[PDB]
Amino acid sequence: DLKIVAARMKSVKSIQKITKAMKMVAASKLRMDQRRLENGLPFATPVQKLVQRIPVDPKEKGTLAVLALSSDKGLCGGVNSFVAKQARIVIKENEMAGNAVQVYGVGDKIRSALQRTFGDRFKRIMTEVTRFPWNFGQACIIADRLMQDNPARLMVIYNHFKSAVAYDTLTLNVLTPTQAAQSAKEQLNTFEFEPEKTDVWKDLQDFYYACTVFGCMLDNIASEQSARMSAMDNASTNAGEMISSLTLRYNRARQAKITTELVEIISGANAL
């Protein structure tokens, strides 16, 4: 018919238009997110390197806690898919040995990905974080929530933002108080702690948690926006292709309608 094809063409044209607009919007947001990274990464790298001097083994047995960072909006490509894939891999690897696993998450997408399969392991989930600009106050809350539930070993899954068209999924084995007390911290003897080490360690550790969450979420946000732009590009292209096909079908149906109506009139005119 005609009304069907015309309605479909109208809808797909609107989709293409909105897709291009959202592409430009996501480009602007990616500029601002790259700025946020460039300003806020130096705040996080030093303490992370300082505590990473203490090597953490990821084979340690104990109550694992997996913090999976994700988004809340869709059309983000497939970054959350890869995050949840890595999380499933980690959970299925660590649950065989007998380590009781708990799951913390950021964003509704990881929740929708893992509800049916690993919903009997969630501990605390946060969302609506990407509404306002990311800030250190948002991260300190999550870090405090992690510390109040002090586990024996912590892992953090997120997406590293290599370039505007390339990301990379990673897993950070994060130090914990249980893993710190089991080490004499001989690697930090080169550093002169102005307060004594035993008095400043708990604060350095809380700062480490906060900075880790901060940097990880910034990288995930940037990767999300890059994937969003790519997805909008692909969607606009596919919409153009569908528009071409529907245009062909519309012209065919138009010609058919004209011919049919005219043949009806002529057959009614010659039967007199």
Partner: peptide
């Protein structure tokens, strides 16, 4: 025109 619903994010 379509950017009128997104002008808050543009420059």
């Amino acid at each position: 025109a379509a950017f009128a619903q997104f002008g808050s994010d543009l420059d």
